[PDB]
Amino acid sequence: PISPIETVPVKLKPGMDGPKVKQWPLTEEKIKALVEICTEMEKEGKISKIGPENPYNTPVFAIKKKDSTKWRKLVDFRELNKRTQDFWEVQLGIPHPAGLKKKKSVTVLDVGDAYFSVPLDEDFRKYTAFTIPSINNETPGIRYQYNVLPQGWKGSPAIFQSSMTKILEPFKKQNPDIVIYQYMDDLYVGSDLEIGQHRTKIEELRQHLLRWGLFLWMGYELHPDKWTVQPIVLPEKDSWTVNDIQKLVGKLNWASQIYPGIKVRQLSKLLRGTKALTEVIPLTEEAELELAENREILKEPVHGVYYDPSKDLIAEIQKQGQGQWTYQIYQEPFKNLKTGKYARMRGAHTNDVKQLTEAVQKITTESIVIWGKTPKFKLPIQKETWETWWTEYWQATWIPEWEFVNTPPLVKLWYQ
Amino acid sequence: PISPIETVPVKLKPGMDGPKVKQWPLTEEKIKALVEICTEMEKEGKISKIGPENPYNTPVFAIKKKDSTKWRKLVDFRELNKRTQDFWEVQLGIPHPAGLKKKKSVTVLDVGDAYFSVPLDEDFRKYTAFTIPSINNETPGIRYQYNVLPQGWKGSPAIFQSSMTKILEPFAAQNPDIVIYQYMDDLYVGSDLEIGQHRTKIEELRQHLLRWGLTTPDKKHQKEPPFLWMGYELHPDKWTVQPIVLPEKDSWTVNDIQKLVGKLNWASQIYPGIKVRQLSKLLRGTKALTEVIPLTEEAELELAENREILKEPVHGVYYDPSKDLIAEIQKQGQGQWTYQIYQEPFKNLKTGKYARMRGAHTNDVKQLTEAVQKITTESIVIWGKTPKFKLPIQKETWETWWTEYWQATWIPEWEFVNTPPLVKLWYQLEKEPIVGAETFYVDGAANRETKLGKAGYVTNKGRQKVVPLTNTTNQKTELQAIYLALQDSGLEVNIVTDSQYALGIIQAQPDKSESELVNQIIEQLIKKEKVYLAWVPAHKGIGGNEQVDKLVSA
Numbered sequence: 030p031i032s033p034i035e036t037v038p039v040k041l042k043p044g045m046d047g048p049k050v051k052q053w054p055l056t057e058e059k060i061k062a063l064v065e066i067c068t069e070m071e072k073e074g075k076i077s078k079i080g081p082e083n084p085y086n087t088p089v090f091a092i093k094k095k096d097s098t099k100w101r102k103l104v105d106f107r108e109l110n111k112r113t114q115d116f117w118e119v120q121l122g123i124p125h126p127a128g129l130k131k132k133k134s135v136t137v138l139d140v141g142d143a144y145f146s147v148p149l150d151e152d153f154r155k156y157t158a159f160t161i162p163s164i165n166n167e168t169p170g171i172r173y174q175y176n177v178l179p180q181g182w183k184g185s186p187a188i189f190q191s192s193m194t195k196i197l198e199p200f201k202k203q204n205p206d207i208v209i210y211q212y213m214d215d216l217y218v219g220s221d222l223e224i225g226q227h228r229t230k231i232e233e234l235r236q237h238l239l240r241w242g243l244f245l246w247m248g249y250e251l252h253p254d255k256w257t258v259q260p261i262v263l264p265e266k267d268s269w270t271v272n273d274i275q276k277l278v279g280k281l282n283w284a285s286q287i288y289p290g291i292k293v294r295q296l297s298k299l300l301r302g303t304k305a306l307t308e309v310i311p312l313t314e315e316a317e318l319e320l321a322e323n324r325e326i327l328k329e330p331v332h333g334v335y336y337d338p339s340k341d342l343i344a345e346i347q348k349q350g351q352g353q354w355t356y357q358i359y360q361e362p363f364k365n366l367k368t369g370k371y372a373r374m375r376g377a378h379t380n381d382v383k384q385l386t387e388a389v390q391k392i393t394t395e396s397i398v399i400w401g402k403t404p405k406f407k408l409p410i411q412k413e414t415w416e417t418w419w420t421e422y423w424q425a426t427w428i429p430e431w432e433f434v435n436t437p438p439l440v441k442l443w444y445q
Numbered sequence: 446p447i448s449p450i451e452t453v454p455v456k457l458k459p460g461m462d463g464p465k466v467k468q469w470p471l472t473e474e475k476i477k478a479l480v481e482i483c484t485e486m487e488k489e490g491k492i493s494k495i496g497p498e499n500p501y502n503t504p505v506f507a508i509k510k511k512d513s514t515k516w517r518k519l520v521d522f523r524e525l526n527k528r529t530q531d532f533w534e535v536q537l538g539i540p541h542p543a544g545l546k547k548k549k550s551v552t553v554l555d556v557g558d559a560y561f562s563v564p565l566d567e568d569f570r571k572y573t574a575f576t577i578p579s580i581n582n583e584t585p586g587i588r589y590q591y592n593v594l595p596q597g598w599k600g601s602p603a604i605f606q607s608s609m610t611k612i613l614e615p616f617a618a619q620n621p622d623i624v625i626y627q628y629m630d631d632l633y634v635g636s637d638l639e640i641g642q643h644r645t646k647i648e649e650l651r652q653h654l655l656r657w658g659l660t661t662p663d664k665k666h667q668k669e670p671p672f673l674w675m676g677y678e679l680h681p682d683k684w685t686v687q688p689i690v691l692p693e694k695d696s697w698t699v700n701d702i703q704k705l706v707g708k709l710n711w712a713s714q715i716y717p718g719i720k721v722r723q724l725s726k727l728l729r730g731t732k733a734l735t736e737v738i739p740l741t742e743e744a745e746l747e748l749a750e751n752r753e754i755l756k757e758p759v760h761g762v763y764y765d766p767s768k769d770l771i772a773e774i775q776k777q778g779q780g781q782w783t784y785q786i787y788q789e790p791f792k793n794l795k796t797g798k799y800a801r802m803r804g805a806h807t808n809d810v811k812q813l814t815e816a817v818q819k820i821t822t823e824s825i826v827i828w829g830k831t832p833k834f835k836l837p838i839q840k841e842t843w844e845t846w847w848t849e850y851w852q853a854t855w856i857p858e859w860e861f862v863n864t865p866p867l868v869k870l871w872y873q874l875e876k877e878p879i880v881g882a883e884t885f886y887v888d889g890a891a892n893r894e895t896k897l898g899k900a901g902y903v904t905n906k907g908r909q910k911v912v913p914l915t916n917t918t919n920q921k922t923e924l925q926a927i928y929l930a931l932q933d934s935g936l937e938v939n940i941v942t943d944s945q946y947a948l949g950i951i952q953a954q955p956d957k958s959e960s961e962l963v964n965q966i967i968e969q970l971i972k973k974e975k976v977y978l979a980w981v982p983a984h985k986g987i988g989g990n991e992q993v994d995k996l997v998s999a
């Protein structure tokens with residue numbers, strides 16, 4: 030029986046107009062699924078039909094979370110979100126829990142439904158307009174607008190922050206060491222327990238939340254690890270070929286943009302001379318020392334790299350082949366805040382795009398946990414390919430920003 | 446005892462005000478006409494006389510459609526439109542014949558007799574005010590305002606369709622066996638029912654529209670095959686474009702061919718094979734709007750293969766949801782591709798073309814991938830599903846390509862179709878150095894001012910070469926050097942370069958380029974049995990890259 034008898038004042042960013050994003054073509058089945066979904070939301074009063082006097086529009090589609098096979102409505106509120114008054118709660122946000130990324134484990138909860146019990150400020154409703162397209166522009170599109178707080182909007186978690194804080198006290202007061210974080214329609218629970226007692230303990234937080242008037246049941250397990258930024262490693266061989274020394278010199282030269290102390294003179298020296306690429310060169314006294322010194326510089330961390338909340342996070346991804354991908358998250362080039370190697374998963378080494386899309390979600394999730402915000406992606410894929418088939422594999426309630434890299438980076442293998 | 450059409454709340458753009466335009470001095474004859482007209486319209490309810498309060502005014506005109514009788518008023522809300530809010534124009538694009546499913550019977554009701562029976566927002570009417578000037582202006586012109594959706598006002602189309610839909614909604618709901626389509630003055634209703642049980646449910650419609658007063662003519666008919674609709678030619682079970690008459694002109698200007706480009710593409714959606722490469726590249730850049738420019742000898746043999754494609758009028762059929770959807774692609778050269786989407790052999794629902802994206806380098810596989818995404822999106826739009834593809838590329842070729850391509854790529858379900866020319870991989874760089882193959886260390890360098898430079902190489906066996914060059918750049922000398930190594934080496938060879946520029950071109954794996962230099966290199970690579978391209982950082986005393994770098998400078 031939960032629904033705030035009032036509505037919180039909401040407006041757009043000073044001097045900014047509502048969204049008017051075009052709706053993209055949807056398959057016949059996704060359409061049918063949205064029709065069923067909305068017909069119910071209408072009766073439940075969450076939404077209402079609108080007349081042509083409303084010009085605003087935001088894209089909409091359907092997906093499926095992990096397990097349930099049941100279709101789920103997803104609204105790409107990216108435009109509305111960046112145009113919506115950056116919720117400056119008179120309480121000053123929620124100081125990113127630096128301790129969530131340190132917890133041995135973290136469980137992700139879809140508390141989205143909660144939102145649908147709170148009414149939306151009448152003056153903002155027209156801004157959440159979406160259309161369920163028709164096949165072949167035959168009939169006109171079904172137009173709707175939200176009555177309750179919509180999942181995916183930046184304002185929902187804020188307008189709701191009040192009700193959530195108290196729906197948690199009977200837990201936060203109890204468990205002092207546990208960490209709880211909220212982002213969009215997700216609740217993140219970290220701890221230092223063990224799978225056994227960390228798994229069942231969540232159930233406790235499930236029913237508890239289920240007793241406060243509350244896809245309710247889905248949880249992705251997580252355990253973020255070491256080397257926020259992975260070390261660069263040089264090969265260790267007994268016999269080097271000219272080709273081996275050439276690549277090594279290439280990697281060190283590259284690494285020196287990150288670590289100034291790296292030297293490659295004593296190694297280049299072995300190169301002086303036009304030898305066959307597969308010929309073995311013996312390492313000179315001097316050369317092995319440099320290879321030793323460099324190796325040592327690479328062990329320590331990079332020089333005073335810090336996160337700047339004002340600047341946005343950039344995420345670069347490289348296709349390494351055989352279902353392996355690399356990525357780096359940073360704000361300033363050569364100053365990584367995180368690097369990783371998302372290995373084999375669903376792509377079932379048959380679909381490059383499905384893999385990339387999972388990688389992106391995984392990178393975004395990791396990003397939400399460390400800084401409490403999604404990063405700007407640089408995808409190694411043609412825009413036309415990605416725009417056609419990113420929504421077929423998407424499964425998160427949120428959506429990040431992305432751009433496309435069309436030139437093959439020389440540094441592919443160095444990140445392997 | 447009819448029920449009203451709910452009114453749509455309207456408003457003017459924020460911060461703006463209603464129009465205040467002056468009225469145009471009309472001739473005595475025109476005035477009488479308008480008075481006759483505005484007199485009846487007021488009776489019908491359409492308009493209404495206002496007092497002096499209304500400060501708003503919109504120009505009004507009267508015109509005689511030549512060789513037809515009477516007059517018809519015409520208001521110019523050009524200014525009321527620029528001050529009216531925005532409406533969700535859901536009229537964005539119409540269906541595609543290929544998306545239509547055949548129906549045993551298809552009727553047409555004329556509901557233009559409703560565009561006026563639909564009220565206008567009360568508080569908005571004051572903005573549609575207009576004045577009928579008096580004869581000799583020795584009297585105050587008669588003032589008026591609308592009580593309905595004006596003809597020409599920004600939001601009349603948007604508000605009309607919305608109202609019509611709402612009224613129709615219940616009918617359609619309780620009549621699954623019939624299909625209604627609303628767009629403008631016409632309502633298309635079809636069904637696969639007995640012609641008897643059809644004109645039946647039609648009466649019901651005409652009658653359902655009665656509960657709101659809206660009258661639909663007691664029509665018999667005024668039409669039959671070929672149904673001329675939106676530049677098409679529709680039939681009970683087939684369609685095609687309007688007769689596409691190729692201008693038998695001798696002097697082609699910009700508009701001559703440019704009105705042949707946008708008129709040829711139109712034709713391409715059903716006639717298999719049409720091309721517009723050698724024709725669109727003749728006016729891609731040209732001064733003036735029109736101009737008698739020469740047609741390349743190539744833009745004459747393709748346009749000739751047009752009067753053989755535009756010779757025999759071909760027909761596109763209708764979509765059947767029970768049959769699978771198939772899409773076939775062909776390579777045509779110069780970066781042109783055509784496709785036919787069909788369900789049954791030779792029964793193309795539709796056809797089309799795809800042109801390469803303007804770029805420096807490229808390869809057929811990437812092009813194919815692009816055509817496939819296009820057809821996919823167009824298919825989702827027209828039929829709500831992705832068609833199965835039948836492509837001119839071997840499965841092995843495609844596997845090799847995507848598993849080794851640096852970018853992520855994918856094509857939906859497809860099958861190889863042995864219809865040449867087949868798309869393939871022309872060369873394939875090694876992953877490791879080749880044992881026993883000669884190692885060529887190359888380099889190039891030019892002089893910024895003199896534009897003079899050198900390209901060359903030195904190998905492990907002592908082979909050496911350096912060629913002087915004029916009117917070159919650093920990038921060109923870097924490519925020429927690789928070219929020399931390719932020309933002077935055996936079937937298997939290891940090339941070492943410091944040119945990031947070169948590697949970037951080659952790693953994109955082009956099979957064709959704008960640059961004749963890149964093309965010669967491609968040509969050499971095709972001839973080789975094995976090539977391993979290695980990169981080393983510049984000015985690091987790598988040698989062999991350092992030795993050649995010296996020979997190539999100064």
Ligand SMILES: COC(=O)CCCC=C(c1cc(C#N)c(OC)c(C(=O)OC)c1)c1cc(C#N)c(OC)c(C(=O)OC)c1
Binds near residue numbers: 545624674682
């Ligand atoms: C679902 O989206 C649409 O229908 C879009 C509407 C496309 C337009 C027409 C149409 C043609 C067909 C055909 N064939 C149809 O049957 C498959 C249908 C149908 O089924 O829809 C109810 C509609 C059309 C246009 C005309 C014009 N001008 C015209 O007058 C000459 C006539 C006519 O019928 O006169 C006797 C018909």
